[PDB]
Amino acid sequence: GGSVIVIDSKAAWDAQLAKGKEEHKPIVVDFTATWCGPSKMIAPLFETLSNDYAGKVIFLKVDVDAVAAVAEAAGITAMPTFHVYKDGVKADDLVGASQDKLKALVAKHAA
């Protein structure tokens, strides 16, 4: 899926956040579920932005079915939910399938 990194475990989740802190590059995470309509509708844009901003922003995907513990720790309630992580901690979020809002989120934290 474009440049998006599929997170398959808590261990991979921690390592990616640790690398993003090392490299001083922001991380945008898409918390998804295959039963969620809005999640499937904005996934193509998340993939496109992952290609456009490759080198500036790290893009992760967390399926709440595959890694329930990471979704629980993140406090997810609705989907799609986007989280921005800087230096290991959550710095921003965006809930909903708004296309303009997602483009603005990635642009805000890539500058």
Q: Which residues of 89-102 are buried (b: 16+ CB within 10 A; e: fewer)?
A: eeeebbbebeeeeb
**Contact in structure between 39 and 96 (CB atoms under 8 Å):** no
Experimental structure resolution, Å: 1.8
- Name all domains of the chain by residue range, CATH numbers in brackets: 1-111 (3.40.30.10)
Method of determination used here: X-ray
The string of DSSP letters for 38-100 reads: HHHHHHHHHHHHHHHTTTT-EEEEEETTT-HHHHHHHT--SSSEEEEEETTEEEEEEES--HH
